[PDB]
């Protein structure tokens, strides 16, 4: 609660893994808007 500029507060990334970012993306897919569409499926279509 008091001023604590005598300690680091970014110790979470010490416990990150190989799949932390991609798991976060997976859990983020929940709340996104539907993507726009260019009509086709690929420029080669």
């Amino acid at each position: 609660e008091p001023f604590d500029n005598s300690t680091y507060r970014n110790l979470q990334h010490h416990e990150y893994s190989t799949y932390t970012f991609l798991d976060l993306n997976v859990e983020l897919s929940k709340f996104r808007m539907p993507q726009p569409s260019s009509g086709r499926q690929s420029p080669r279509h």
Partner: protein
């Protein structure tokens, strides 16, 4: 009335108050530090008011070029022709000497997220794409944790902040390329190709990522905006000189007692920065050899110039250098400056995307020539050739990497030709 010495910024007027990660970087901590405050009102004021305040602040690009932010962001004010519009936050941070973006994305990530919201609303964009360098894995994961909290709190996504605006923030990691800091090379790296910059006459505001109207903005440019809109714009303009306005993050590295990242008022003397924040150059200010003021692209200045220079775009342009990214790399007198500039040119040779002839061939040529200059294995009639080759690369490439490679060479040749010729003469004496 007016200011004449633009330094000694107080804690109150510092935007990035969690710069050292000594407070909570998550949503709970960020909110108590003023973040995400009345963002609904800022969005409801409309894009015109947000852009008007960004123009009032006089804010310029914090990722190099320094183009005015309000004018650049207003290229998206046009109506929609059906295509989506995106804000693309540049988080590549590949410039040697520069580590300021890294510090926002992990200690004030909510600043970046809410700046994405405010700007994208100002440009009328549906989503933000934060392109972080792949080497910043922990910072990217911290940013995505912040994005997840912003989503779960309703600040991003459907009915963002209660404004009715729908906004998304996607992080897309790079894969080890410094050229992907360049805005169009970054765009094409988002699209899954090689990070090769595009020819400019089609501008990103017309044809950007996925061929849609986009604005590419630096992390700091985006992140200051919520404080710009929430604090007044006039308040931001009351810092630094005219044109170059506000405050900047400074990276002081090199031959310095305390290399550090600090937020200092713009137009600060380089001396005040180095002595007050960085603790001075090792051995004192007498032991100063060059200083590179704005990251590896900005040419060096000698101790004489650096004695009474101010840290802003105009003052440093007067000194034949640039402000760049405000990444000062100081060198004491125990430094082989030819070796340092050759190392920088080697970096630029390793980072050239190879697309266009001048960068691809000439930066490699200049690396070969500069490697000889370290040994002295050259004649003094090659210095003028190196200058002419650098001018042949400058202004003839697709992107500004060629320019940012030619400029360190020119800044070395301009202020340290006697050292180059002394090395060449010593080599001629040793090898008969």
């Amino acid at each position: 009335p007016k200011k004449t010495s633009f330094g000694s910024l107080k804690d109150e007027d510092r935007i990035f108050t969690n710069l050292y990660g000594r407070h909570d970087w998550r949503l709970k901590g960020a909110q108590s530090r003023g973040d995400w405050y009345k963002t609904k009102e800022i969005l409801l004021k409309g894009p015109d008011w947000i852009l008007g305040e960004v123009k009032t602040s006089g804010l310029r690009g914090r990722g190099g070029a320094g183009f005015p932010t309000g004018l650049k962001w207003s290229f998206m004010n046009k109506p929609s022709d059906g295509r989506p519009k995106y804000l693309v936050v540049n988080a590549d941070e590949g410039e040697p000497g520069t580590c300021k973006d890294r510090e926002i994305i992990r200690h004030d990530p909510h600043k970046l997220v809410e700046g994405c919201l405010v700007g994208g609303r100002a440009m009328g964009a549906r989503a933000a794409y934060i392109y972080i360098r792949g080497e910043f894995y922990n910072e990217a994961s911290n940013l995505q944790v912040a994005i997840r909290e912003a989503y779960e709190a309703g600040l991003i996504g459907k009915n963002a902040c209660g404004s009715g605006y729908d906004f998304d923030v996607f992080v897309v990691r790079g894969a080890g390329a410094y050229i992907c800091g360049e805005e169009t090379a970054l765009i094409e790296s988002i699209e899954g190709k090689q990070g090769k910059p595009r020819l400019k006459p089609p501008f990103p505001a017309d044809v950007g990522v996925f061929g849609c109207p986009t604005t590419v903005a630096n992390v700091e440019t985006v992140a200051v905006s919520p404080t710009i809109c929430r604090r007044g714009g006039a308040w931001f303009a009351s810092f630094g000189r005219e044109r170059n306005s506000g405050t900047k993050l400074f990276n002081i590295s090199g031959h310095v007692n305390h290399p550090c990242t600090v937020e200092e008022e713009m137009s600060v003397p380089l001396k005040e920065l180095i002595e007050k924040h960085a603790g001075g150059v090792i051995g004192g200010w007498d032991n100063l050899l060059a200083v590179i003021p704005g990251g590896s692209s900005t040419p060096l200045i000698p101790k004489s110039v650096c004695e009474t220079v101010l840290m802003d775009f105009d003052a440093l342009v007067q000194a034949q250098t640039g402000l760049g990214t405000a990444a000062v790399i100081v060198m004491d007198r125990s430094t082989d400056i030819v070796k340092a500039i050759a190392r920088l040119i080697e970096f630029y040779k390793h980072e050239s995307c190879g697309q266009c002839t001048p960068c691809r061939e000439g930066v490699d040529w200049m690396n070969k020539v500069m490697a000889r200059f370290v040994k002295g294995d050259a004649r003094p009639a090659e210095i003028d050739s190196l200058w002419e080759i650098s001018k042949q690369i400058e202004g003839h490439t697709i992107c500004a990497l060629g320019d940012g490679a030619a400029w360190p060479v020119q800044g070395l040749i301009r202020h340290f030709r006697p050292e180059l010729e002394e090395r060449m003469q010593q080599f001629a004496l040793q090898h008969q």
